[PDB]
């Protein structure tokens, strides 16, 4: 074995989200916590409520969490986001009427400044949350007005989507999936016979289950109630569905 860089006996490595491993020669594998080193925290992650309907409630609820955790620049930035996202500043379709809030210096420019600072600080968490929350004839003017209409530049949608993908991957790392769905809800780009019930016979249109073998199905809560106590097909088929439907 000519190519022999053999005597390997030490190594360090990052693993998980908040973890580190290393071993040495005198030899048990010692790991360590680095949660306070990275700019992201799981504790703050579990609390960050998000919503598409009531934006203000999300901002003011996230505001208290950072104070409950210890961070400060967020208990400022979230307040600024709250005051800079009210429906009173709603844009108007006509370009004549009033200057849009985007062109106000405290509008787009503030967003770019915050994004740049937190890009330097390398904190994908706050980037993801801020971006998610803030998300011949005279004809050739309304298009430009709609371009200037938005608080986020239409020419950098890709980076925002990348931020929102990366935070989802880290959330999957941590062990929370519902939050991974809430965050990803904002991303722009996309990701015979026999139709009756079997326990109440009313036509089903939404969520349902069935056996692969039996071929008898119905409403999901119906099956919860039915299989809470028994092990037979509800329609006199004889299948022990706990041995057929599941793997």
């Amino acid at each position: 074995d000519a190519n022999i860089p053999f005597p390997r006996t030490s190594g360090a490595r990052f693993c998980g989200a908040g973890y580190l491993v290393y071993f040495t020669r005198p030899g048990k594998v010692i790991i360590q916590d680095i949660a306070c080193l990275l700019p992201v925290h799981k504790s703050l992650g579990e609390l960050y409520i998000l919503n598409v309907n009531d934006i203000q409630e999300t901002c003011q609820k996230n505001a208290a969490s950072a104070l409950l955790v210890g961070r400060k620049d967020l208990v400022q930035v979230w307040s600024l986001a709250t005051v800079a996202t009210d429906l009173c500043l709603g844009p108007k379709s006509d370009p004549d009427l009033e200057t849009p809030w985007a062109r106000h210096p405290f509008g787009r420019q503030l967003l770019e400044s915050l994004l740049a600072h937190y890009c330097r600080l390398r904190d994908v968490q706050t980037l993801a949350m801020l971006c998610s929350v803030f998300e011949d004839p005279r004809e050739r003017e309304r298009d430009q007005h709609d371009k200037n209409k938005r608080l986020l530049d239409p020419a950098n949608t890709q980076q925002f989507d990348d931020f929102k993908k990366c935070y989802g991957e880290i959330l999957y790392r941590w062990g929370l999936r519902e939050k991974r769905a809430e965050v990803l809800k904002f991303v722009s780009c996309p990701p015979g016979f026999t139709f009756q019930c079997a326990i109440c016979h009313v036509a089903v249109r939404g969520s349902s289950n069935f056996c692969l073998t039996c071929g008898h199905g119905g409403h999901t809560s119906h099956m919860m109630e039915w299989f809470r106590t028994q092990e037979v097909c509800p329609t006199g088929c004889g299948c022990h569905c706990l041995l057929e439907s599941t793997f």
């Binding site: 400060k72 400022q76 307040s79 600024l80 005051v83």
Partner: peptide, 7 residues
């Protein structure tokens, strides 16, 4: 008011 008061 937010920008200049009570950090």
């Amino acid at each position: 008011r937010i920008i200049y008061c009570s950090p």
